[PDB]
Amino acid sequence: SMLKKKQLTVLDLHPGAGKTRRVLPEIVREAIKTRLRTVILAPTRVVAAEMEEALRGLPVRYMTTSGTEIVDLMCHATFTSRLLQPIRVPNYNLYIMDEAHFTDPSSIAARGYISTRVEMGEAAAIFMTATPPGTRDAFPDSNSPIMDTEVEVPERAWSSGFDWVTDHSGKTVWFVPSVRNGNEIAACLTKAGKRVIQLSRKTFETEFQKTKHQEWDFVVTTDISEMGANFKADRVIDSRRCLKPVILDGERVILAGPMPVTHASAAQRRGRIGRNPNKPGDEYLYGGGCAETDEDHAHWLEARMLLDNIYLQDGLIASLYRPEADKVAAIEGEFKLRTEQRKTFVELMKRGDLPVWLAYQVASAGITYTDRRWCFDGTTNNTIMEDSVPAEVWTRHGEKRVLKPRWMDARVCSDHAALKSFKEFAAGKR
Numbered sequence: 001s002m003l004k005k006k007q008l009t010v011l012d013l014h015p016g017a018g019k020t021r022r023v024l025p026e027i028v029r030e031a032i033k034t035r036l037r038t039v040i041l042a043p044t045r046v047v048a049a050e051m052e053e054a055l056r057g058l059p060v061r062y063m064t065t066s067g068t069e070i071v072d073l074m075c076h077a078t079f080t081s082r083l084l085q086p087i088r089v090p091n092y093n094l095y096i097m098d099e100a101h102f103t104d105p106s107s108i109a110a111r112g113y114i115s116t117r118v119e120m121g122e123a124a125a126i127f128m129t130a131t132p133p134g135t136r137d138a139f140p141d142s143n144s145p146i147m148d149t150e151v152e153v154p155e156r157a158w159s160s161g162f163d164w165v166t167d168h169s170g171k172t173v174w175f176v177p178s179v180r181n182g183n184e185i186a187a188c189l190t191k192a193g194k195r196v197i198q199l200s201r202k203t204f205e206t207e208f209q210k211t212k213h214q215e216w217d218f219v220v221t222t223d224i225s226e227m228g229a230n231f232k233a234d235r236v237i238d239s240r241r242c243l244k245p246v247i248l249d250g251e252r253v254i255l256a257g258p259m260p261v262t263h264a265s266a267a268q269r270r271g272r273i274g275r276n277p278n279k280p281g282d283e284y285l286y287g288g289g290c291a292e293t294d295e296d297h298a299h300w301l302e303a304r305m306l307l308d309n310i311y312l313q314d315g316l317i318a319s320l321y322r323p324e325a326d327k328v329a330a331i332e333g334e335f336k337l338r339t340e341q342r343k344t345f346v347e348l349m350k351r352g353d354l355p356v357w358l359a360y361q362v363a364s365a366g367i368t369y370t371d372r373r374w375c376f377d378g379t380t381n382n383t384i385m386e387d388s389v390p391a392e393v394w395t396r397h398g399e400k401r402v403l404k405p406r407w408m409d410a411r412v413c414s415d416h417a418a419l420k421s422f423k424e425f426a427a428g429k430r
C-alpha cells in the first residue's frame, strides 16, 4: 500500500491513457481496502457526475456541497469552498485530484492546501494530469495518431474563405479565447447551417448534456473543456488563444486581449481527440504558437487570497504547490481577513458569484454583503458600458443608477451573461 506513504505523486500518463476511467478506480478500491479516509476531486460537476456512475458499486459518496468506509467525491471548488467554512477540516489522509492541471483559483488553492498537508506528514496525495506545471510539449502521445496541421484559424466571423471549416462532415470542437468570441464564431457557423453547442464555465453543466447526442456539428468552447471533457469528435480547431485576467497595480482587473495559450492548454485542447485507439486520423488544426507568461495571471494571486483565509491547526497558512508557487506576487498571510469579513468574502464569492479579487476588495473594505452602494459610487472611469451606452440598473430603493463599481473587475462585464448577473447583483436581486 503505497497510498499510506506521506508523499505526493503526479500521475502524468498521456491524454486518454486511462487515468480517470481505469487508474482512478484501481486507486479507490485500494484506498477502501487499506481503510484510508479518501477524497476524490473532480474539476466539474459534469465530470463528478460521470465518476459517480463509474464508481456505482463502490462506497463512493458524491457531495454536492464513516470516514474510512466511504470515499467522498466532490468538485475542486466544492472542496475549497468547504475549507473556507467555519468548522475544523474533514481530515482526509488521501487526496486524489483529477484533471490537476485546472488553473482556476479554487483548484490552485486546493493543490496548495493538499500539498501542505502532505508536507506536514498528514496525508498522501495523487495529482492526475498529463500536463503538470511546467510542461512544454503541446503535442503529447495519444491513443491513435493525430493529424496535426497549422492553419489560419478564424478569429472573427467570416463571409468567405475558410471552406475547410464548413466542408467537414464530422464533429468539431473549436476552442475560443472568450465567451464573446465564441458567440460570434457560433453565430457564423449556425448561419452556415451547422448545429452548434456553446460551452463556458457558467453554462457548462446544462449545455454539455447536449453533446452526448448524435445531432451536433460544432462545439464552440472556452478553455473549460480542457478539464476532462469528453466529446465524440473527429476534429479540434484551436485558436491557440485565451484571455488572461491581470491585476494592474493591485487596483483593477483587466482581461488581457487574446494571447497565446500555454503548452499545457494546447496539449489538453488537442487532447480532446485521438482518444479512440482504433480510430486514427482525427485532426487538430491550430492557428498559432504557445507561450508561458502566467507570472502576472490573476488566478494565482486569487488562490493566495483563498488560502490566506483557510484556517488550519496552530495558525499555519498553506503554501501554493511548489511547481506553481513562483508565479505570484504575494506574501503568505497578507490577505488574511478577520472573521466577519472573511464571512462576507465567502458570501460575495458564493452567493454574490463575484470574482475572488473583487470579493476580496469589497470584504476588506468592511462592506456587508447586502450593501451594494459600492456598485455605483466608483470613479468615473469605472463606468460599465452596454451597447455603447452606460449601463443602468433599477435598485431595490427604486432608483435608476449608472453602473460604476468602486473596484473594476473586467470579468463582471466581459460578456452578456456576466453583465446580466452583475446588474442583478448591483440591483440587490441576490
Ligand SMILES: Nc1ncnc2c1ncn2[C@@H]1O[C@H](COP(=O)(O)OP(=O)(O)O)[C@@H](O)[C@H]1O
Residues within 6 Å of the ligand: 013, 014, 015, 016, 017, 018, 019, 020, 021, 022, 143, 230, 275, 276, 277
Ligand atoms: N463514455 C465512455 N464510454 C467508453 N469509453 C470512454 C467513454 N469516455 C471515455 N472513454 C475512453 O476511455 C479511455 C480512457 O479515457 P480517460 O480515462 O478519460 O483518459 P485520461 O483520464 O487518462 O485522459 C479513452 O480511450 C476514452 O476515449
Ligand SMILES: [Mn+2]
Residues within 6 Å of the ligand: 019, 020, 021, 098, 099, 228
Ligand atoms: Mn482524465
